[PDB]
Protein backbone atom coordinates (compact mmCIF):
# COMPACT_ATOMS: atom_id res chain seq x y z
CA UNK A 1 0.00 0.00 0.00
CA UNK A 2 3.07 2.23 -0.08
CA UNK A 3 2.85 4.66 -3.00
CA UNK A 4 6.02 5.71 -4.83
CA UNK A 5 6.81 8.17 -7.61
CA UNK A 6 9.63 6.90 -9.85
CA UNK A 7 12.33 9.41 -10.69
CA UNK A 8 12.64 10.49 -14.36
CA UNK A 9 15.03 7.72 -15.47
CA UNK A 10 13.01 4.91 -13.88
CA UNK A 11 9.79 6.54 -15.09
CA UNK A 12 11.12 6.63 -18.67
CA UNK A 13 11.76 2.88 -18.43
CA UNK A 14 8.25 2.08 -17.17
CA UNK A 15 6.63 4.33 -19.78
CA UNK A 16 8.55 2.60 -22.57
CA UNK A 17 6.42 -0.53 -21.99
CA UNK A 18 3.11 1.29 -21.54
CA UNK A 19 3.04 2.71 -18.01
CA UNK A 20 0.71 5.71 -17.92
CA UNK A 21 0.93 7.11 -14.36
CA UNK A 22 3.35 8.99 -12.12
CA UNK A 23 2.48 7.14 -8.88
CA UNK A 24 2.72 3.40 -8.29
CA UNK A 25 2.89 0.75 -5.64
CA UNK A 26 6.16 -1.11 -5.26
CA UNK A 27 4.50 -4.23 -6.69
CA UNK A 28 3.40 -2.29 -9.78
CA UNK A 29 6.94 -1.00 -10.37
CA UNK A 30 8.29 -4.55 -10.13
CA UNK A 31 5.68 -5.82 -12.60
CA UNK A 32 6.53 -3.18 -15.21
CA UNK A 33 10.28 -3.62 -14.67
CA UNK A 34 10.05 -7.34 -15.34
CA UNK A 35 7.82 -6.52 -18.31
CA UNK A 36 10.52 -4.19 -19.61
CA UNK A 37 13.25 -6.84 -19.38
CA UNK A 38 11.15 -9.40 -21.25
CA UNK A 39 9.80 -6.95 -23.84
CA UNK A 40 13.34 -5.73 -24.62
CA UNK A 41 14.65 -9.35 -24.50
CA UNK A 42 17.45 -8.58 -22.04
CA UNK A 43 17.46 -11.98 -20.29
CA UNK A 44 19.82 -14.80 -21.25
CA UNK A 45 18.02 -17.54 -23.20
CA UNK A 46 20.01 -20.38 -21.60
CA UNK A 47 20.39 -19.21 -17.97
CA UNK A 48 17.34 -16.98 -17.73
CA UNK A 49 18.20 -15.27 -14.44
CA UNK A 50 21.03 -13.38 -16.18
CA UNK A 51 20.23 -9.93 -17.63
CA UNK A 52 22.47 -8.08 -20.10
CA UNK A 53 21.89 -4.30 -20.06
CA UNK A 54 25.15 -2.59 -21.12
CA UNK A 55 23.67 -0.61 -24.04
CA UNK A 56 20.34 0.06 -22.34
CA UNK A 57 18.62 2.49 -20.00
CA UNK A 58 18.39 -0.36 -17.47
CA UNK A 59 22.18 -0.54 -17.23
CA UNK A 60 22.36 3.17 -16.45
CA UNK A 61 19.80 2.56 -13.72
CA UNK A 62 21.71 -0.41 -12.30
CA UNK A 63 25.23 1.07 -12.46
CA UNK A 64 26.51 -2.19 -14.01
CA UNK A 65 26.28 -3.69 -17.51
CA UNK A 66 24.88 -7.05 -16.40
CA UNK A 67 23.32 -8.67 -13.37
CA UNK A 68 21.42 -11.71 -12.15
CA UNK A 69 17.80 -11.48 -11.01
CA UNK A 70 18.89 -13.59 -8.01
CA UNK A 71 20.65 -10.46 -6.66
CA UNK A 72 17.47 -9.32 -4.92
CA UNK A 73 19.22 -6.80 -2.69
CA UNK A 74 20.79 -5.05 -5.69
CA UNK A 75 17.42 -4.90 -7.47
CA UNK A 76 15.68 -3.30 -4.50
CA UNK A 77 18.68 -0.99 -4.07
CA UNK A 78 18.35 0.30 -7.63
CA UNK A 79 14.59 0.77 -7.38
CA UNK A 80 14.52 2.55 -4.01
CA UNK A 81 17.36 4.84 -5.07
CA UNK A 82 15.29 5.89 -8.12
CA UNK A 83 11.92 6.68 -6.51
CA UNK A 84 10.31 9.05 -4.02
CA UNK A 85 8.16 7.58 -1.27
CA UNK A 86 4.79 9.28 -0.86
CA UNK B 1 0.70 -31.68 -11.25
CA UNK B 2 2.77 -32.52 -14.35
CA UNK B 3 1.64 -31.66 -17.88
CA UNK B 4 3.10 -32.49 -21.28
CA UNK B 5 2.47 -29.77 -23.89
CA UNK B 6 1.27 -30.83 -27.33
CA UNK B 7 3.58 -30.10 -30.29
CA UNK B 8 2.40 -26.55 -31.06
CA UNK B 9 2.42 -25.37 -27.44
CA UNK B 10 5.79 -27.07 -26.98
CA UNK B 11 7.10 -25.16 -30.00
CA UNK B 12 5.97 -21.91 -28.35
CA UNK B 13 7.61 -22.73 -25.01
CA UNK B 14 10.84 -23.73 -26.75
CA UNK B 15 10.99 -20.38 -28.57
CA UNK B 16 11.47 -18.59 -25.23
CA UNK B 17 13.98 -21.08 -23.82
CA UNK B 18 11.95 -23.93 -22.31
CA UNK B 19 14.10 -27.05 -22.30
CA UNK B 20 11.83 -29.98 -21.36
CA UNK B 21 8.68 -31.68 -22.62
CA UNK B 22 7.16 -32.03 -19.12
CA UNK B 23 6.28 -29.12 -16.82
CA UNK B 24 4.07 -28.05 -13.98
CA UNK B 25 1.09 -25.88 -14.86
CA UNK B 26 2.74 -22.94 -13.09
CA UNK B 27 5.83 -23.31 -15.30
CA UNK B 28 3.71 -23.35 -18.47
CA UNK B 29 1.91 -20.19 -17.32
CA UNK B 30 5.23 -18.49 -16.54
CA UNK B 31 6.70 -19.28 -19.97
CA UNK B 32 3.45 -18.39 -21.77
CA UNK B 33 3.29 -14.92 -20.24
CA UNK B 34 7.00 -14.55 -20.94
CA UNK B 35 6.30 -15.46 -24.58
CA UNK B 36 3.59 -12.80 -24.90
CA UNK B 37 5.87 -10.12 -23.45
CA UNK B 38 8.97 -11.23 -25.37
CA UNK B 39 7.04 -11.14 -28.66
CA UNK B 40 5.29 -7.88 -27.63
CA UNK B 41 1.81 -9.23 -28.32
CA UNK B 42 0.03 -7.21 -25.63
CA UNK B 43 -1.71 -3.93 -26.40
CA UNK B 44 0.35 -1.01 -25.13
CA UNK B 45 -2.70 1.00 -23.96
CA UNK B 46 -5.11 -1.72 -22.73
CA UNK B 47 -2.58 -4.31 -21.64
CA UNK B 48 -5.03 -7.14 -20.94
CA UNK B 49 -5.62 -7.43 -24.71
CA UNK B 50 -3.31 -9.84 -26.55
CA UNK B 51 -3.02 -9.90 -30.35
CA UNK B 52 -2.44 -13.35 -31.82
CA UNK B 53 -2.74 -12.73 -35.57
CA UNK B 54 -0.02 -14.34 -37.70
CA UNK B 55 1.50 -15.83 -34.57
CA UNK B 56 1.88 -19.32 -33.15
CA UNK B 57 -0.35 -18.19 -30.29
CA UNK B 58 -3.25 -17.58 -32.69
CA UNK B 59 -3.19 -21.20 -33.81
CA UNK B 60 -3.23 -22.32 -30.17
CA UNK B 61 -6.17 -20.07 -29.28
CA UNK B 62 -7.98 -20.46 -32.55
CA UNK B 63 -8.64 -16.72 -32.35
CA UNK B 64 -6.80 -13.52 -33.36
CA UNK B 65 -7.12 -11.87 -29.93
CA UNK B 66 -8.13 -12.57 -26.36
CA UNK B 67 -8.34 -10.76 -23.04
CA UNK B 68 -6.24 -11.84 -20.07
CA UNK B 69 -9.36 -11.21 -17.97
CA UNK B 70 -11.00 -14.26 -19.64
CA UNK B 71 -9.46 -16.75 -17.23
CA UNK B 72 -11.63 -19.72 -18.21
CA UNK B 73 -10.89 -19.18 -21.91
CA UNK B 74 -7.15 -19.06 -21.21
CA UNK B 75 -7.17 -22.26 -19.15
CA UNK B 76 -9.38 -23.90 -21.78
CA UNK B 77 -6.86 -22.99 -24.50
CA UNK B 78 -3.97 -24.32 -22.43
CA UNK B 79 -5.62 -27.58 -21.35
CA UNK B 80 -6.58 -28.27 -24.97
CA UNK B 81 -2.89 -28.07 -25.92
CA UNK B 82 -1.40 -30.26 -23.19
CA UNK B 83 -1.82 -33.72 -21.68
CA UNK B 84 -2.06 -34.02 -17.91
CA UNK B 85 0.34 -36.60 -16.50
Amino acid sequence: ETLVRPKPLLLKLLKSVGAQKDTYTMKEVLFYLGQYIMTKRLYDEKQQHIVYCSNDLLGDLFGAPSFSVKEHRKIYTMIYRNLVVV
Amino acid sequence: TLVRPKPLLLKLLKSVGAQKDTYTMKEVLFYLGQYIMTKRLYDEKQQHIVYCSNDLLGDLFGAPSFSVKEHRKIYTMIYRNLVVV
Binding site: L30, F31, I37, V69 | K26, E27
Partner: peptide, 11 residues
Protein backbone atom coordinates in the same frame (compact mmCIF):
# COMPACT_ATOMS: atom_id res chain seq x y z
CA UNK C 1 13.45 -21.98 -14.82
CA UNK C 2 12.00 -19.09 -16.83
CA UNK C 3 13.01 -15.47 -16.38
CA UNK C 4 9.39 -14.77 -15.39
CA UNK C 5 9.58 -17.23 -12.49
CA UNK C 6 12.99 -15.92 -11.42
CA UNK C 7 11.60 -12.38 -11.52
CA UNK C 8 8.40 -13.29 -9.65
CA UNK C 9 10.41 -14.97 -6.82
CA UNK C 10 12.60 -9.75 -6.32
CA UNK C 11 6.51 -9.04 -7.38
Amino acid sequence: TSFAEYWAXXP
